[PDB]
């Protein structure tokens, strides 16, 4: 059988609605605008979108 | 269940009416005019508009 | 609630009647005449007008 | 309140009777005659007039 | 399904009655007259018409 | 077999009716008119058409 | 004989119909249009074609 | 005489048809397209060819 | 075999009855009359005829 | 012997009846008429003919 | 004596009838027509000829 | 006397007819045509000639 | 002695009976008639003669 | 004394009867006729003569 | 006294009759004709003369 | 008193007539002509003069 | 209370009449003329003025 | 009080009659004539005058 | 006092009777005739006179 195996709730800690998933997404926003202002090209504002989908489709592979 | 999960008020710190959202928007204005004067083309004054909408529609994805 | 949230007076520093808003407008004038003399076409003298309105209608979005 | 806000005398430096306003107007004269002699059409001598009024009505917007 | 998908109101920001659609059309007018006066041929005054229709029939392709 | 293979819905995120496909097409419009006004030649207004078809026939190759 | 030799299904992970081959092709599309709009020359829209064939004829060399 | 000398099958592990020779070639493909998209010059797609021949003519020197 | 090869409907987009073929012919009319009025010689009104036949016999070479 | 040598079908992709050979010929038509209308001299309509023959006699040198 | 000296078949890989010699010649054709259409002068169509002879008389110096 | 002094055949490895002298010359050809196509000026095709003579007159200084 | 020195057949490529010498002479004819029709003076039809002799007596200086 | 000093035969490579001196003279011919046809003035056909003498009297200064 | 001071023969290596002084002068010739053909103005053929005298009167300052 | 103070002859090593002062001046000549040929403007040939005087009036400050 | 708080005379070291304020202003002059001569546009001579006022109004904020 | 404050004689080094003020003025002369000869317009000879006055009225601000 | 202050003889190097003042005047002559022949208007032959006086009255300001 499995040991240490536990709980999982660790998943709920890092999961969909979380504190860490909430700060990791807000940093993408705030330094996304930063690296935009210093440059002014737009692929970087789109760089926020790839974090939205990545975390979303990423978290479903945890199970 | 969730841990560390907290408060959120961190959202209120970086949210709609905030100090950091107030300075990140005012820098777009002041270096927007800068890179305009050194060049004098207008897509850059419009570069302020894309920060208005980006932060606005961005903050609603935090939840 | 909000943290760091402060004062604002930072707004009064960069606001309507300010030192930085006073120098950023005077540079538009002095390099506006410059790029005019080296060329002598008039859309550039009008380039001062777009800084007048931009800062004016820009500062009202800070709030 | 305001910070950095200062003095203004910076205005007196770039203002009506100044050193920089005195040289920026004298360059209009000397390269105005230049681009006239190489061509000999008169709208360019009139190009000095638009610098007279522009700086005059421009400086009053600083305040 | 779709993510990030949002709102749209971004469309209302750049749409038919807007601030940016209002300034992008007024620049066509003011530099249209400019490039007319320096030349005096009329296809350029007609250059304003092609911006009227282009934005109009353009915005309907957004959906 | 395949791993990581997933979902696809990533396709629905960047697909036909999307948020990113909606902004990438609206930028073609707004800087299309820009580079038109500064020049006034028409192949550039047609530059919007090639983005319409390119994204359309492009997205069908994703599968 | 061979060791570690395995499975292959790793091939099916990166192969013809895949998740990674699906995202690597969609990035060519979205930054292809980007570098087009900022420039407006067409060899770049054709830059999508060379990724179609390259991955296609590339994957057949894996075996 | 020779000691430790063994088997060789280690050669079959890293040889022509292998697992490691299969992944080392597939990385050339996937980061070849990457460094292409971020740049769009073609010598890099040809960078896959030099890995094909190098491993091929390289493995024959093992003996 | 062929890749990327597609659809064609791109042909229907630029083909006989189209939007772009409709605007490219109407510009010949409107600037044809222009360059006529400023001059008043008639080979230019005939310049519309050569666009009629050119697009007609041109489109049949696409296949 | 030869390596990487492949398929060719790459030839069929860029060959006689193709998608890229179909768009590269249709651009000659549409910007041929453009540079004609802005000028109205006819060697440019003949510029379409030299693309017909060039691609035709060019493709036969690929082999 | 010589080491590493090998095979040559590397020559057959890059030689007369090859895959890389087939793509390097087809790019000359497709961007030759490109830089022609954007300009319409003919020395560039002749630019394909100098690649024909250069590779031909070049490959004979390999030995 | 001399030590380590050996053989030379290392000279035969890098000498006139060699594998490395064969690949170092073929790269000059293939990236010579590359940097030609992206530009179309001819001093670069002549850049192959200076590698022919340089290696030739260079190798004779080894002794 | 000489290096790179080759073949010549490059001479036969650009020589008397050639493909490039055949197209360079036919362009003189077709744009000779063009610039004649738009003007109707005859020194230009004679402009074809000077290309006949120039290439003829020119090619003999190659050796 | 002198080092590296060599051979000269490098002189024979670029000298009187050479491959590079043969192509550098044939380009003068072929783009000489080009820039003639697009213009039809004759000093340019004479531009071939100045290359004949220049290379001739130039090569004698090498020694 | 002096150290390292040597020989000079380094002077004879780069001096009047040398290998490097022979190639540095022949490059002036071959790219002199190049930049002439692409332009056809004559100050550039005279650009060879200034290299003749410069190296001549330059080398005498070495001592 | 002074220690380590020595000899000077180090001065004679780097002084007026030296080996290092002889090579540092000859490099100015040889890369002076280089950067001239690639450009053909003359301030650079004069760049040799400023090294003549600089070393001359420089060495007298050593004492 | 305050510690380390000292003297100030550090202010007198970097203050109005100082050694460092005297060299920092003289460098603006000497490299101001430099970047002027290499270019010859005049906003740079005015670059000395902005250092005059900046240090002046800057030093008053130290207190 | 002040420290490091010194001497000034640094002023006498860069002052009115100096070595560096003597070379910085002579470069304006020699590259002034250069950029004149390559162009032949006269505002540039006047560019020497603005260095005369600038250094003169500049040095008086050092104190 | 002054440092670095030297000699002047640098003045004698660039002064009235000099090598550099001798070549800078002879270039005015030789490219003066050039730009005359290609045009045949006479203000340019007079362009030599303005170099005579400019260097003459210029050198007297060095002191
Ligand atoms: C778990 C699945 C992982 C799949 C990830 C796929 C990555 C494959 C890489 C493709 C080519 C690399 C392009 C280099 C990047 C490149 O060349 O562009 C560079 C660009 C930012 O520009 P830079 O500031 O780096 O400056 C470079 C510029 O000069 C070039 O325009 O990258 C971005 O961040 C913009 C993103 C927009 C592009 C969107 C593509 C769609 C992405 C979707 C994948 C979502 C992941 C979900 C997974 C959970
Ligand atoms: C979260 C959603 C993210 C979506 C972001 C969409 C980005 C897709 C990129 C499209 C093509 C890139 C064009 C390159 C940019 C380009 O070529 O123009 C360049 C231009 C500035 O010009 P530069 O100084 O860089 O000089 C280049 C010039 O020579 C070209 O005119 O960019 C700007 O900053 C002007 C912005 C006006 C254009 C407005 C477009 C509408 C934007 C709306 C999106 C709002 C985001 C909201 C998200 C919260
Ligand atoms: C916050 C709101 C942002 C909205 C900004 C709107 C920008 C949209 C761009 C429209 C087309 C771009 C034209 C390119 C510019 C162009 O083609 O002209 C070029 C012209 C200067 O000429 P250049 O020296 O660049 O040389 C180019 C010339 O050859 C063309 O005549 O631009 C100027 O600086 C003159 C401005 C007069 C035009 C006034 C327009 C009215 C503006 C009002 C917006 C005020 C902003 C307030 C926001 C706070
Ligand atoms: C702060 C307020 C800014 C408002 C500025 C107004 C600019 C609007 C542009 C109007 C049409 C542009 C005409 C192009 C210019 C054009 O086509 O003429 C060109 C002409 C010089 O000729 P060029 O050497 O460029 O050669 C072109 C010739 O072939 C055409 O005759 O421009 C001048 O410098 C002459 C100025 C006389 C014209 C006086 C007009 C009255 C001006 C008053 C504004 C004073 C500003 C005060 C602000 C402080
Ligand atoms: C989304 C759909 C895009 C379709 C765009 C169609 C563009 C096809 C180009 C046709 C030939 C190009 C002519 C070159 C232009 C040319 O030769 O004229 C040049 C002329 C301006 O003259 P310039 O100052 O450039 O000087 C050139 C003069 O010497 C020639 O008279 O262009 C204009 O801006 C005037 C526009 C009047 C012509 C109106 C035509 C009707 C247009 C309707 C399309 C509306 C677009 C709606 C889309 C939303
Ligand atoms: C996926 C399939 C990819 C195929 C792409 C085909 C590209 C082949 C390039 C042909 C010659 C290049 C011409 C250079 C461009 C050139 O010379 O014109 C230049 C012109 C813009 O003018 P510029 O501002 O660059 O100034 C240059 C001017 O002086 C020349 O008139 O380009 C445009 O953006 C106008 C587009 C109208 C032309 C429409 C052509 C039809 C296109 C259809 C393809 C749709 C793609 C769908 C794929 C999803
Ligand atoms: C795809 C096939 C391409 C074939 C194109 C044939 C072009 C050969 C050029 C012949 C001589 C050039 C004459 C210069 C032009 C010239 O000298 O006239 C000049 C004239 C316009 O006059 P401009 O305003 O340029 O001022 C010049 C005047 O002073 C001279 O009268 O050109 C026109 O646009 C009028 C067209 C009427 C002439 C009709 C001819 C029949 C054309 C039929 C071809 C249809 C093409 C179909 C292809 C799809
Ligand atoms: C692979 C084989 C390559 C051979 C290519 C041959 C190119 C040799 C250049 C000859 C002289 C250059 C003339 C400059 C061009 C010149 O002076 O005319 C200029 C003319 C266009 O006029 P522009 O708008 O450039 O304005 C210039 C005018 O003022 C002069 O009338 O060029 C064209 O595009 C018209 C083409 C009609 C001429 C047809 C000639 C027959 C061509 C056949 C070759 C087919 C290639 C097949 C290869 C696959
Ligand atoms: C291995 C042997 C290497 C020998 C290479 C010889 C190169 C010597 C350079 C001569 C003068 C340079 C002219 C600059 C180029 C120049 O001024 O023309 C420029 C022209 C293209 O025009 P662009 O678009 O650069 O615009 C410039 C125009 O405004 C000038 O018309 O160059 C071409 O690509 C056309 C080629 C036709 C000319 C054919 C010449 C015959 C070539 C034969 C050599 C074959 C090589 C075989 C080797 C394997
Ligand atoms: C062992 C002996 C070493 C001696 C080497 C001699 C190098 C001296 C440098 C002379 C001036 C530098 C010119 C810069 C280069 C320059 O300005 O041209 C630049 C040109 C390539 O053009 P780029 O693409 O760099 O673009 C620059 C262009 O805009 C200028 O046309 O250089 C080449 O690769 C073409 C070579 C043709 C020139 C042939 C010269 C004859 C060479 C013979 C030496 C053979 C070596 C044998 C040794 C084994
Ligand atoms: C390799 C040897 C090079 C030698 C080339 C000799 C060129 C010397 C220039 C003489 C005076 C220039 C006259 C300007 C030209 C001039 O004033 O006429 C202009 C005339 C064309 O008229 P346009 O359209 O330029 O309009 C100008 C008219 O208004 C004047 O009637 O030129 C031609 O193309 C006609 C040619 C007939 C003249 C035939 C002369 C015999 C030529 C024989 C040389 C054959 C070369 C063989 C070499 C391989
Ligand atoms: C090594 C020795 C170097 C000495 C080179 C001498 C160059 C001195 C420049 C004199 C005045 C410049 C004239 C500008 C050129 C100018 O104004 O004419 C321009 C003319 C070509 O006309 P474009 O197409 O540039 O258009 C300009 C026209 O509108 C003017 O008619 O130049 C040529 O290529 C024709 C050459 C015939 C002239 C032959 C002259 C005899 C040359 C003999 C030297 C042989 C060199 C041998 C050295 C190895
Ligand atoms: C060691 C001694 C150094 C003294 C060097 C003297 C350089 C002083 C610069 C004078 C004014 C600069 C003119 C810019 C150059 C300029 O405006 O012309 C430009 C011209 C080449 O024309 P570009 O292709 O750069 O195009 C520009 C054209 O549009 C202008 O006609 O320069 C040359 O290479 C031609 C050389 C003929 C001129 C001969 C002059 C006599 C030179 C004698 C010096 C020999 C040096 C021996 C030293 C060992």
Numbering used by the authors:
A (entry chain 3E), B (entry chain 3D), C (entry chain 3C), D (entry chain 3B), E (entry chain 2B), F (entry chain 2C), ...: 2 to 64
What does the paper say about this structure?
Conjugative pili are widespread bacterial appendages that play important roles in horizontal gene transfer, in spread of antibiotic resistance genes, and as sites of phage attachment. The pilus is a polymer of the VirB2 protein (or pilin). The structures of the pED208 and F pilus are very similar, with overall dimensions of 87 Å in diameter and an internal lumen of 28 Å in diameter. Thus, selective binding of PG to pilins occurs in both F and pED208 pili, and thus, the F family of pili are polymers of a selective and stoichiometric protein-PG complex unit.
